[PDB]
Structure formats: structure tokens, C-alpha cells
Symmetry: C5
């Protein structure tokens, strides 16, 4: 088997169509997602053309090994795609209609800067290395690009599945390569984050600040320290569901900033006691009384500043 | 090999049948379950007709590669099917009796709204893409649809295994497709949740309320804060056995509501001390005396309201 | 290839031999165990018979594809058995001696009611679906059933490996099926449970009870609350090494009952302080003094009752 | 293909030799290790002999399927060997020189009695089942047995890789079997255990006892109970990196013995307070003054006794 | 198929080239990384030479099975090569241009001494075993060695991908072997370590030091102990993301040293109380006052010494 010769030198255009059957297993840490889909290919192989009058049949079916098929590969994949050829159909002019069912663990990086309120653009890259005889260019047949209505990605909202119609044609090891970009747009389902991490993390912080209505140093040490240990658990629980980013994340910023509120709360609690012992509970009172307004106002403003910077 | 030609203008009806051998590994987080089953197929291929007087035998056995077999695929599956052909048997009229033993990790979404008192409807979808020559329609032979009596799903009760007899016939990429729905109904075994999660969580919550019979602010802070940190452990332990749902769950609601009871108890405990110090233990007494009745009554009513809304 | 025709009506008896080479990876949560073993099969195929004086050789070797071999399958297996044919040997009368080396992750349910002092009966089920021409019945050749002396199952004691000699012959999808039961009896190695989970758990309970010799409410709260949280931590460590059973387990019973001892301890500790504050330390004294004897006696009796009910 | 006939009765001697390329993934819990190695085999097949004069070539290369190769299998392996034939070379007299590159997850039990100061002897067992025509005996060609200098096992020191030259010849299912033993000796790298588990543990114990110089009952509690819990988190961390042994381990012994020091230190702390309250701080003083010498002397002696018994 | 005969004595030079497509999954514990790449090979097989005048074509394409291909293998790999031949192209003089697309989990050891500020040199070793007829030597064609611009390794910075051009030629089991070294240089992205582990760990240590401004032994025990438990949680969280090194790491050093600061702070806190009780709060004051300056100065100096020794 050899590639179809050009009538004229014009390169072979392979019409590509992807149709997602099932979407699943999005790993934030590994920045991977698994997909179950149909891959449709179409090209002109005049060597396979036939007269529909004499041949009787208007369509001819073939086995993969029987005819020439372009080596279309996936760029960003981990597992060896579960390729199962479903159909090969030749028209009278020699237009091959290929369709295979595949599945692969795709490697698309994620941007966690606005996590868990982040949105992503997942990619599926199709590629074709041009052969010695003639060059191969990829094309998108938008008619065969889509996704099924049942398609769901657990804890995410599937917005779009589109294809960057103009392929990125480039040179590699002295040979032409045509790369295509299939983009799956998803937004995160941040609902479960609010009652499981955000609000409990806030309740522990507000419980910590009850130390500004207490004069008991012994009880204040308990109140601020306990809640701090409970904040360490929450910061750890969070960093385990995320990869080690070289940037600060929205949840990451808030969590880190809260460590400072605990640190300053411990300073206030210490000062109050030192002053009490130093027989000047008058200053101790005015510091504590200020902290009562300061801590919530600075926390409310700090969070506005963060949300402003992040969104 | 080519499909069996139609005497008439009718489509080929492929009679399906599934018989679950072993059911196992239901992953709540991934919304997957694994299954070990028999897949039985039957169609009429008149090209395979024989005379048992000449052929000698009354039934003829074949290898999968030897004869035409319809490309029946599973829609919602992760791993490639562990397909092992057990039997292919042709009758003199040309009725092929196919039977394969398979196993697959099926992707069926779960509804956790009433968890752990939830019930599910797991699905197995069979599909067949119609070929160029003639269309293919799926059918259910209820005689070969079932499950073995030993079939057990750890921590679940297997109610039914039925098949939506009318196949969903639809168009896809200019071709006819016949989809079938096999439904496995299961109810959760919530027994182990009561002494491991629910009762221990109520014990720690009731322990926290002993602070309504204590005047020791220092001991109260220990009681109310310690139990709250134990409650945080349960909230984390629970959310690890579940996926991040865009809705509130029954256990999720209760556990979140309990965070407010800890928050208000911390307020009461603070108030009591502030008033004690402010030399008015008279008001402090009446607040604590109310909180003794209030906390259990509001918790009892709140839970009735939740259970009402969820069931 | 076709099955061996019967001299008479009688079904073909296939002699089954199962022999364990290596036993490993028993998963309590998944109720699975992996096995490395030899599967020996023997049947009479008169079509393969030969004269030993004329053929010279007394025994003739064959390739699996060359001769007819009965489709013997495993019922309770997860991943397709790693079948490697070791030997096929035909005798002069036509007695085929088959031997394959396999490995599989077997699905046998476990009874955790007496955990970690439980014993199990693991099963390996062989099955054969009867063909159109003649029925197939399984048989146990006890001479080729066993296990190697090195065979060890980590954290378990291997008692027996026997076979239920009478096969369960039954109808399924209009065809005869002969099922065989290979039983591997194992008892748990509960030694490591005593100094790692049982004894540390009792020390924290007895430490909790030192509050019956303390009048310091603040120290008692710190005492009983600390140890309650350590017991929560053990209840969690235990439930992670076990599946969610719809029944109570021996360790499960004890651990749940202990929560009540902690709950009543907290009540006692509260009562003592309430009475102390109420200026009647006389009753407070008699309550703690009773609790001193009551708590250990009721715990000792309760455990006798549990052990009685469970064994 | 059939085995090489004997000139005489003599059994066929197959000369083995393993050469470890890469050693890795030693799982203590599963008692498995993975290996990447060369397997070299050599036997005399006179049917393959040739004259080096007329043939021209002094060596002839063959494909595995072309010539008879002895069924050499691994006994203690989990996943089917990644066998890749590298070379088959026949000499003029008919001496076949076989070499394959393999990789397997090997199952060799481990002895944790002296953990983490333990040493192991990992095994790789080669086996050959004798055929109907003639018996097969294994042999070690020490010239082709070894390991590469780069070979490293993470967290272990590779001492030796030797072979038990005399094969264990025995009967199994009426047939002769020749088993060979390849032994890989390794010693554990216990360095990381000292600053991460041993030393941090000794400190929470020394802190646990600063409660022998304090008369404050509350502080002692927190100080010895505190302190104690930290050692419950340390106990769980060690038992998660180890399987459930039916014997006591060195680290296991030490950790368990500390649970008694913590228990007796809580008794001492209770006694001191009871006596203080009972208005006899004179006895309370003499008990605590003794504790301060007793606890460290008994701990120092106890550890000597343990180390003596374990090494 | 047989190797290409030498014109002369000279050995066959195989020109290698690796091109990383996708780099991913770097496991610190397992010291492995996964790679998706192109492997290009080139050698002179004069048996395949042809005249470009009469043959018409410039280049001739071949199937892997049709022509002789050198057995190039990877040394340090865990996963079987996902070899997919993309192109085989013969020039008129007989220069074969081979190109395959592969993927493998590579085993390259990591040096954690400067962790998380460490840099690594990952290796990919190509090897070729010389055949009976003629020896094979590897060579680097630097033109086909590289990496794509999109290539990203999560939490790492990819510096270089170079090849040690001179192959390590050595003897093994009486045969010549040519080994090549492909080096991938990476530096760690330590950003996320600073607000998630380093800074929190320091806030808790400084919180512990507020006990040098407190006279409340009861409150001091809560402080130095609660913060010690937090420091255990951080040592645990850290040692779980790392393998058990036989050396001290930078983070490991700091963490261990901080234990001593907690231990000495507990001694100080004890001394202060003992002296207070011993009715000499004068010495207790001077110890506490020194400790105020001592602890931060000694910690600041100790860290300078560590950083000096480690970098
Ligand atoms: Na306390």
C-alpha cells in the first residue's frame, strides 16, 4: 500500500470529525481527562474509484489492511488509544469515508488561578506526518464534529466542543506536519466547595475572634490555637485536591491570608495578657476593643482586594 | 465478509440478551460499576443455510472471523470489553446463535440527594450502527435477559435487572443507530453509616451541649471547640467517600447545619462569660437556661424539616 | 473442530484439577484474592485414539488449536485469566491430559461478623456450558487437586484446599451447565490487632476513667474529650480496612459500645461539677465513687455479653 | 516442534543465568519487588547441528517459532512476564544460545522482626516441567548470572545476587520438575527512620514527663495526654508502611512498650493530684521525686532488654 | 532477515534521535517520569540500495517485517514500549530512515538533598546488543534530538534535553554493547511550598514563642504542645511526598532542627514554673527574658548554618 498520487501536486486534504460519546475522569492534579469518542476521516483516493453503472453497487466497503489509510495520531495522549474500526466506505469517485471508535486519557494543562470558580479549555490535538511522495493537510468537517446530549463530566459543566478549523502546519525533522485543535470548554461546579470548605473555614475563623470578648488568656490560647490547627487541616485537605502551581490560586490566597489573621490574633491575645499582668488592663482593654472592629473590617477589605485582583 | 442481504425491504433485527454473572466494584466518586456478564446475539443470515442430510450435523459451529457478525458496541464503558466468544451456532434456516462472555467498567451517573438512604438505576447501553447495504435494529429477547442468584454488589441491594424493550432508533452522522437500555436497580445498605458516622456525630454534638450546665468558660471553650474539630473530621471523612455534587445531599445538609449549632453554641458560651465578668450572672443564667431547651428543640425540628424536604 | 461424539447417550465427563502455586493479595474491602495455579483437564475423545504397537509412541502431544478442548470458564473472576497452555497429551484410548497455568483475581465474599477473629471459605468456581451435540458434566480428580507447601497468604493461615466433588448441574438459557466448587479455607492472623488497635484503644478508655479520681472539672473535660477524639481516630482507622457491611462486626460492636462509655463519662463529669457548684459535693462524691466501680464492672460484663453473642 | 531426543537416557540440562538490568518498586505491604533482567538459556539440540565448513557460517540465527525452546517459567510472579526475545544462536554441534529480556513483579516474603534495621533475601524461582518424551533438568551457568553496577533499589542496599546451583528436582501431578533459586540479598536504609520517626517520638515522650516537675494537674494532663496522642499518630504512621505480621517487630515492640509508660505516667499524675487534694502533698512529693529517676531508668533498661532480645 | 554485511571490518553505526512530544507524571517517591516521544534511527544497509535513474523514484518505503532493523532497546524503563512505527524510508545508496512513536515510564534516580529547591538530570538510555556477524555502535544525530515548545512537566521547569554524543561501549555476557545517554535537565517549582508548608510551619513556631511573654504555665503548655502537634502534621505531610533517602534533605534538616526548638521551649516553660513555685520568680524572669532574644537569634543563626551547608 502507497499514498494516493496527486492529480496535480496539491497535497491530500484529510477531513476530520470528532464526536464525543462519553466524557469522564478529569484529574486536576495530573491535568488529564478521559474521553470516549468517534473519529471520522475522509480523503480522495482515485485508485479506488469505480463506475456505479457497471459495478452495480453505489458504495464499496473495505477492511483497514486492504486500502491506504493516513496515519492520523493524537499528540497529547497518555494511553494507547483503544482504536476499533467501525466503517470504511468508498464512493464512485474514490472518496473514502472512515470511522473509528476510540478512547484516550488526554493531557491538557489547567489554570487554577480562579479555583474553584475556574473555567478550562481542554484540547484534543490531531496530527498527520506528510509522506515522501506527497504532503498531507488536515481539515475540519464541522458536520461530523460534536458531542452527545447525555455527555456529562462529573463536577463540571460542559459548555462547548469546537474545532480550530485552520490547521497549524509546521516543519518537524525535515517533514511537513498538519496539527488540528479540538477545544472542549468546561466550567467548574463550585457548589460543594461553599458548605464543605469555604463556610466551615469561615466559621472556625469567626470562632477564633471570640477571644476579643474574653479576658481569660488560658481560654484565648485554646480558642486561637485550636481553630488554627483546624485551619491547618483545611489548608492540607485543599492542597491535596490540587497540583503544585508556580502561581497563587484564589482559594490559596484566602487560605494563606487567614494564617496571618491567626498570627496577629495570637499577638493581640499575648499583648492583652502581658498588659493585664503589667497591672495596666486599661491599655489591654483599648487594644482588645479596637481588634473587635479592626479584624472583621481588615478581613472584609482584604477579601474585596483579593476578589478584585483575581476576577 | 458482508452483511446478510434483505429478501424484503426490512432491516436486520439483532436479538440481544444479557445475563449478569458477577456484579462488583461500584465507585461512588467515579459513578462507575464493574460487571461480568453473558451477551447473547441472534440474527438471520440466509447465506449460512445448510442441509443436515448432506452436512451430516443438525447445527453448525463457527469461528468469529469465519462469518459476518453485527458490530454491537457498549455506549457507557471505560475499559475495552474483555470479549471472549463462548459459542456461535447456525441452524439450517440460517439463524445465528451468538454468545460471548464480557466484563466492563460501566459509566452510569448516580443521584446522591438522599445519600446514604439513596437508590440508583444503573444503565448498560447496547448500540449498533447501520451499514451501507441495510439498516440494523436491536431487539430484546427477554428469555435470555437476567442475573444469577449469587450476584451480589457489596454494600448494595440488587432489586431488578430489566431491559427497555423498545430500542431508541435515531440518526447520527447520516446513519441509523439502534440503542438499547438495560437497567439495574439498586438500593444502598445504609446500616454501617448509623454506628460509624451518624450516631458518633450525634454523641459529639450532645457532648458539646453539656456546656449549658457548666459555668467554667475555660472548660466550655474546650468542650465546644474540641467536639467541633471532631465534627470537622467526620465532614472530611464523609466528603472523601462522595463526588463533588452541584446539589446538597441529605448527609451534607445535616453535617452543614450542625456547623451552625457549634457556631451558635460558641456565641452562647462567650455571652455567658462576658455577662459573668460584667457582674450580671443573672442574665447569663437565663440565657444558659434557655439554650438547654432551645438547642435540642431547634435541632429536633430542623432535622424534621430537612427529612421532610429530602424524602 | 467439533466435540467427541458419544458412544451412547451419556454426557462427556471432564476431570478437573486445580492446584495453587502462589496465593496472594487478599483485599477485605473488595472481597477479592489473587491466585497463581495449575488447571488440569481430562476427557475421552475417541477420534484421537491410536494403536500403541503400530504408532510406536505410547503418548502423542498436540497444540491447543489442533484438537477439540472443552470451554471451561471461571465464574467469580475479575480480570481475564492469564492462560498459558503447558501440556496436551493423548493416550492410546483417546484420553486427553490437558494442563494450563493460570492466574486470576477471584471474587469470593467475606463474613466479617467475628473480625479480626474471623475465618473465611474462599471459592473458585469452574463451569462448562454444554454444546448442541452433547452435554458436558464436570468431575473432580482429587489426585490433581492441592496446593504447594510454600503457598502463603500474608496475614492469614491457609487451612485447606478441597473440592465439592458433586458438581451443581443446572439449566441456563435453555442449556445444561455443570458448576464445580473449589474451597480454600483461611483463618485470620489477629496477633497484630491486639498491640496496634485493641490494647491502645483500651488504654485511652482507662485513661478516660481517671476523671473518677479527679475533682478538677477543667482537667476532666480535657481528659474525657481528648480520649474521645483518640477513639474517634481508631473507629476511623478500623472502618478504612473494612467494607460497609449490612451487619454489626465484633470490633464494630465493641468500638460503638465504647462511644456510650465516653458519653456517660461526660455526663458523670458534668454532674460532679454541677453538684460541686450547687454546694452539694456530698452527692457528687457518692456518684464519682459509684462510677469508680460501675464503669469497669459494666464494661467487663458488656464485653462478656458481646463475646458470648458473637462466638 | 518436539524436544531433542536423548543420545541415551540422560535428561536435557538447560543452562540458565539471570542478569538484573534494573531493580525497583519493593512493596513491604505486598511483599513484592519488580525486576528488569536478562534471562539466558542454553541446551543441546543435535537436530539443529551443522558442518561449519560447507555451511560457510560458524553460527546460525533462528526465530522462536522455528525451533524447539524449553518452557521455562517463573514460580513467584504476579503479572505475566514481559518476554522479548533478543537472540537465538545455534553453534555447529547444536548448542542453542537463547537470550530474552524480561520484567516481572516478584512475590518474595519479607521478615520484619528487626524492622527498620532488617535485612532480606529476595527470591526468583525458575522452573521447567519435564515432557512426555524426556525429563528436563535446570543448571546454573554462573558466567551469565549477575547484576549491573547502576542497579539500585530505592531505600535499600543491594548486597548480593547469587544462584543456588543445585536445582530442587521433585514430582508434581505425575511429572518431574526442576526448580532453581536466584537469591537477591538486600539490607534496609534505616537512616530516614531516625530523624523522622524514632527521634521525634522520643521527644513527645520526654515532653510527656516534664509533668514530673509540675504540680499543676491540668498541665500534666495536657503534657502526658497531649503528648500521648501525638504517639497515636506516630503509631498509625508506622503500621501503614507495614503488613499485618503474626509476630512482634522491633519498632512495634518499642512503640507498644511506650503505651505503657504513657499509661503509668497518667496513673502517677492522677496519684500526685489525689494525694495533693487529700492534704498529703508529702507522699505526692516522694512519688514524683522517684518517677523522675524511675521512668528514665526503667525506659533505658527496657530498651536494652528489647534490643538484646531482637538482635 | 540478517544484518547488513560490512564492506570492511567496520561496525554498523546506528544514528539515533529522540524528540520529546509530551513530558509528564514525574513521581518523586518512585523516581520515575513518563514520556511521549519520537525515536529516529538511521543505518547503511547496502543490500537495500537502488539506482534512482531506472527505479524512477528517489525513496522506497518498507514495512518493519520486510527489512532488517537493529534491536534498539531502553535500559531504564518500567512500561513496555508503546512502539508504533510511523515511517521507514530507503535512499538510493541504502540509508534507512526509521521513525517510531513511543511512550515509557522511565526510571531515573533523583537527588533530594536541596529539596524543594533541587534540580535534577533525568536520563533515557538507548542500548544495542551487537550480533554474531558484526558489532553495532550507536551515534547521535543532534538534528533529530530535541523537544516541542508546548512540552511541560507539571511543577517543574524544563531546562535542556541533550545527548551524550560519545556512546559508552562495553562488554556484557561475551558481547559488545553500545549505550547512549539522553539527559533531560529540570529544576523544581518551589513557589507553592512557601505559602503551603514553609511559612505556616514558621507561624506555628513563632506562635509557640509567645510563651516567653507569658507566666501562665497552664497556657504555655497549651501553646508549645499544640504548635508541636502542628509541626508533627507538617513533618508527616512532607515525608509522604518524598522517598526514604539515606541522607538528610534541606527541608528535612530544618523540620528536625525545629523539633529541638520545641523541646528546649518545653524545658524553658517547665523551668519558669518550677522556679515560680520554688518562690524564686527572680531567676524565672531572667531565664524567660534571655529566651526572648536567644530562641530567635539561635534559630536565625542555625538556619544560616544549614543553608550554608546545603547550598
Ligand atoms: Na486544656
Amino acid at each position: 500500500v502507497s499514498p494516493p498520487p496527486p492529480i496535480a501536486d496539491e497535497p491530500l486534504t484529510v477531513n476530520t470529525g470528532i464526536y464525543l460519546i462519553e466524557c469522564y475522569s478529569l484529574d486536576d492534579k495530573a491535568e488529564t481527562f478521559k474521553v470516549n469518542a468517534f473519529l471520522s476521516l475522509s480523503w480522495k483516493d482515485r485508485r479506488l474509484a469505480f463506475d456505479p453503472v457497471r459495478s452495480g453497487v453505489r458504495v464499496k466497503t473495505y477492511e483497514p489492511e486492504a486500502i491506504w489509510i493516513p496515519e492520523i495520531r493524537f499528540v497529547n495522549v497518555e494511553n494507547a488509544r483503544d482504536a476499533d474500526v467501525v466503517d470504511i466506505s468508498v464512493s464512485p469517485d474514490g472518496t473514502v469515508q472512515y470511522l473509528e471508535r476510540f478512547s484516550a486519557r488526554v493531557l491538557s494543562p489547567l489554570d487554577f488561578r480562579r479555583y474553584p470558580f475556574d473555567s478550562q479549555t481542554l484540547h484534543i490535538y490531531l496530527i498527520v506526518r506528510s509522506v515522501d511522495t506527497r504532503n498531507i493537510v488536515l481539515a475540519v468537517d464541522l458536520e461530523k464534529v460534536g458531542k452527545n446530549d447525555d455527555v456529562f463530566l462529573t463536577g463540571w459543566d460542559i459548555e462547548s466542543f469546537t474545532a480550530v478549523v485552520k490547521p497549524a502546519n509546521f516543519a518537524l525533522e525535515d517533514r511537513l506536519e498538519s496539527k488540528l485543535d479540538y477545544q472542549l470548554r468546561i466550567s467548574r461546579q463550585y457548589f460543594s466547595y461553599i458548605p464543605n470548605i469555604i463556610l466551615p473555614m469561615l466559621f472556625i475563623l469567626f470562632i477564633s475572634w471570640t477571644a476579643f470578648w474574653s479576658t481569660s488568656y488560658e481560654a484565648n490560647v485554646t480558642l486561637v490555637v485550636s481553630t488554627l490547627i483546624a485551619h491547618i487541616a483545611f489548608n492540607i485537605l485543599v492542597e491535596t485536591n490540587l497540583p503544585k502551581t508556580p502561581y497563587m490560586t484564589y482559594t490559596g490566597a484566602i487560605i494563606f491570608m487567614i494564617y496571618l489573621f491567626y498570627f496577629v490574633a495570637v499577638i493581640e491575645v499575648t499583648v492583652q495578657h502581658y498588659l493585664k499582668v503589667e497591672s495596666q488592663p486599661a491599655r489591654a482593654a483599648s487594644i482588645t476593643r479596637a481588634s473587635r472592629i479592626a479584624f472583621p473590617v481588615v478581613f472584609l477589605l482584604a477579601n474585596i482586594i483579593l476578589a478584585f485582583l483575581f476576577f
